């Protein structure tokens, strides 16, 4: 009989695991998270002080 | 070479007296006295602004970039008089193997001028000019090639000289009355004194191409864009206009053809001075949702009739 403990090893990781680098992550169940983070991409403007036409 | 020295510096000189024409007509279409006090109607004054701009005005960017900024007037002046060479005329220098090819790959080459000044100045303010004139003149270049097909398939082929005998009798205002009256708009795609006009004239936002050059470099933008006015008034009067040809006397052609151009050249400026900004997102709404299924219905039209009833080169 094969227990959990067993299932553990083949589990989402790297099969075979070690190697030189370990950085992966198992991968999300339903594609990633919202990388809403990072960059708002909002431009400031002095358009008034003096002299917009406007 | 002589003829081409004789199309640059008497050239020149037409884009320095529209700054007359650009305030003398202008002024009176809104009730103002324009040039006086300089010469006998102000006449000194277009060759004086040659003396004021060029010769003490010393303006640089200050953030810059490189070698491109200073670029820009030369590829602003460089592809716009280059304009002239394929015209028509009552003689062409060297007349294209197809002509009005060069004539639209120029135009749209001339466009790089107000593109190339987004990247003069490193600092946001002046690319936000440059990118309202990308989207005033990128959809305006898909119906300046297809109401060119449908003239072209018409009357005769690419080149510019059968464009000039084809019209024997009668104008092609007349066969083409919808394609007529979509090129006193289409021909208003590069930034020019007008209504629709682009990014260029201050009225809401900072001037395009003005606000990162000088004097020198920005008086060598008006010398471009000004000059595009008159060779769309010419290019018009060559493909709707035409009246007489008559290859024995180049006078009486001559005379004939500057004043269909000049009742032109009067219209620009008569829709300048007449119509408010149509707005960036709108502009975009005038073309491409509403006049190029019109443009492509009347291109259809002029598929058929040359099968209809015969009418081919």
Known sequence: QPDVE?????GGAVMYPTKETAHWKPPPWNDVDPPKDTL???????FGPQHPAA | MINILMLIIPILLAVAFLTL???????????????????????????????????????????????????????????????????PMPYPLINMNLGVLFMLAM??????????????????????????????????????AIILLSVLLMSGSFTLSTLITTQEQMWLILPAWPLAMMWFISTLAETNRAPFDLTEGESELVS????????????LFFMAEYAN???????TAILFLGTSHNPHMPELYTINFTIKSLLLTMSFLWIRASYPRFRYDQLMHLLWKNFL??????????????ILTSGIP
């Not at chain 1, 708002?40 to 002095?46: C, D, K």
């Open chain 1, 6 to 10: 067993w299932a553990e090893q083949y």
């Open chain 2, 229 to 235: 006015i008159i060779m769309m008034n010419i290019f």
């Open chain 2, 208 to 219: 395009g191409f003005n606000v990162e050059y000088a004097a020198g470099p920005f008086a």
């Open chain 2, 293 to 306: 299924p019109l443009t492509l219905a009347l291109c259809m039209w002029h598929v058929s009739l040359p």
């Open chain 2, 21 to 87: 024409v650009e305030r003398k007509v202008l002024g009176y279409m809104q009730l103002r006295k324009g040039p006086n006090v300089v010469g006998p109607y102000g006449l000194l004054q277009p060759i004086a602004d040659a003396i004021k701009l060029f010769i003490k005005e010393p303006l640089r960017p200050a953030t810059s970039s490189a070698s491109m900024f200073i670029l820009a007037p030369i590829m602003a002046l460089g592809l716009a008089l280059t304009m002239w060479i394929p015209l």
């Open chain 1, 40 to 46: 708002v991409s909002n431009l400031t403007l002095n």
């Open chain 2, 107 to 144: 135009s749209s080459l001339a466009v790089y001028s107000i593109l190339w000044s987004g990247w003069a100045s490193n600092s946001k303010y002046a690319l936000i000019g440059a990118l309202r004139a990308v989207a005033q003149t990128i959809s305006y270049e898909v119906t300046l």
